[PDB]
């Protein structure tokens, strides 16, 4: 019942009676009252909470407001079948403390649930969303995290979370390649265009090999993305 | 309206007031209350239960999420139109007990009803979702039940649910081929392309064929999934 005011941003898909505050999965407050501050444009947002986080609340308590992921849906202003944004919650130690600032993203995965963060480094995003799917043979073995920048322009890094009972799947020689969009062929005495996994079609995915000699790889060991399944074979290199 | 707390992994499409827990079909109980143990993150639900299961609500009590199957509303972002996730339960023996950890998956197939559980192993999954359609002449005669991967790596086991009246069908010689996404070609004096089972180019879709002269196969007997129809000829091989 506890009111806490903090300072969002923009309050675009923020409603004063419906929209909640999930800690990591379960509803703990309903947002209130919504006001603002003139003063530096900051949309002072006042929201109820129950008793057992109130311990908790301090000052390392981090907010980000957690849209809904962008789909078909999402692009084709369909806005009413897609879902209400909400806002995500963090706590840290911090001291005992009842006004926050956004963040403007979700922070680092710290759950120690047993499942695996590994990081993919490659030249760009590719055609990757938020929870765009990984497969092992074309079972879903893990979804895509989150993506960022490296502070080098040169890279982007891709962090990308796997399932606790596929956490040994990942050795160490492990090959990860893109399969997100169709590509057609048009070859000789017979054009074989064929397509597989529409949901690669619409999202985007990533699929990975597994060789049965290395050690199990593991704690957020980089790896490559190879943009293709023909450019992560593995052959030997010969210079011309 | 007994109340047993159940520690979930992650509460996202459980609804305090709305998610039911059904038994093998029958909606028994209704989830009641949510709450969180930070101690490991576990999140215990308490879930009223007619008392008809209170007798075998036992300590070998397997409880895991059921969400709905991935398809075309899932895979664009439309979760308003996809469907409710729900628990499903199956009890065992044990011992009477309160106090049950989620399982992470659905548990082996153990009805009795006189529908048939093969298996059929493959290279990998392919275009195959679960409850993706078995035909036998383009008429749907069962569906896949689930699939995982064998201990061995060089594998994907598939097994797959036949309906009573067609066990007969399933003989020890029968031949599995994948029909599953679109492939065209372009021919000399003309390209036949041609699509005709639309619900396995979206979902994926397994056909068989039954030999009149062997026996009928049963329990659980391994096949070989075959990439194609063409792939499934029965000729001679002829080494050269």
Same mark, same amino acid.
């Given at each position: 019942?506890? %009111?806490?005011?903090?300072?969002?941003?923009?309050?675009?898909?923020?409603?004063? =009676?419906?929209?909640?505050?999930?800690?990591?999965?379960?509803?703990?407050?309903?947002?209130?009252?919504?006001?603002?501050?003139?003063?530096?444009?900051?949309?002072?947002?006042?929201?109820?909470?129950?008793?057992?986080?109130?311990?908790?609340?301090?000052?390392? %308590?981090?907010?980000? !407001?957690?849209?809904?992921?962008?789909?078909?849906? =999402?692009?084709?202003?369909?806005?009413?079948?897609?879902?209400?944004?909400?806002?995500?919650?963090?706590?840290?130690?911090?001291?005992?403390?009842?006004?926050?600032?956004?963040?403007?993203?979700?922070?680092?995965?710290?759950?120690?649930? =047993?499942?695996?963060?590994?990081?993919?480094?490659?030249?760009?995003? =590719?055609?990757?969303?938020?929870?765009?799917?990984?497969?092992?043979?074309?079972?879903?073995?893990?979804?895509?995290?989150?993506?960022?920048?490296?502070?080098?322009?040169?890279?982007?890094?891709?962090?990308?979370?796997?399932?606790?009972?596929?956490?040994?799947?990942?050795?160490?020689?492990?090959?990860?390649?893109?399969?997100?969009?169709?590509?057609?062929?048009?070859?000789?005495?017979?054009?074989?265009?064929?397509?597989?996994? !529409?949901?690669?079609?619409?999202?985007?995915?990533?699929?990975?090999?597994?060789?049965?000699?290395?050690?199990?790889?593991?704690?957020?060991?980089?790896?490559?993305?190879?943009?293709?399944?023909?450019?992560?074979?593995?052959?030997?290199?010969?210079?011309?």
């Amino acid at each position: 019942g506890n %009111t806490v005011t903090i300072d969002f941003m923009s309050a675009d898909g923020i409603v004063p =009676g419906r929209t909640p505050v999930r800690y990591q999965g379960v509803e703990v407050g309903t947002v209130q009252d919504i006001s603002l501050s003139d003063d530096l444009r900051k949309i002072e947002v006042k929201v109820s909470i129950k008793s057992d986080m109130k311990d908790a609340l301090r000052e390392e %308590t981090q907010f980000w !407001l957690v849209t809904p992921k962008a789909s078909l849906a =999402g692009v084709s202003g369909l806005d009413a079948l897609v879902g209400g944004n909400y806002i995500g919650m963090m706590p840290g130690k911090g001291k005992e403390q009842d006004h926050f600032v956004a963040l403007d993203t979700q922070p680092k995965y710290r759950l120690d649930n =047993g499942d695996l963060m590994i990081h993919l480094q490659a030249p760009d995003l =590719g055609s990757l969303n938020s929870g765009s799917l990984v497969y092992f043979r074309k079972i879903p073995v893990g979804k895509v995290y989150d993506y960022a920048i490296n502070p080098n322009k040169q890279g982007v890094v891709i962090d990308v979370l796997i399932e606790r009972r596929f956490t040994d799947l990942v050795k160490k020689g492990s090959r990860f390649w893109n399969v997100s969009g169709v590509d057609a062929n048009v070859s000789i005495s017979g054009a074989k265009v064929k397509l597989e996994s !529409l949901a690669a079609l619409v999202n985007g995915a990533i699929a990975f090999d597994s060789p049965e000699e290395s050690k199990p790889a593991e704690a957020e060991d980089t790896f490559g993305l190879y943009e293709d399944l023909a450019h992560s074979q593995r052959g030997v290199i010969i210079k011309l």
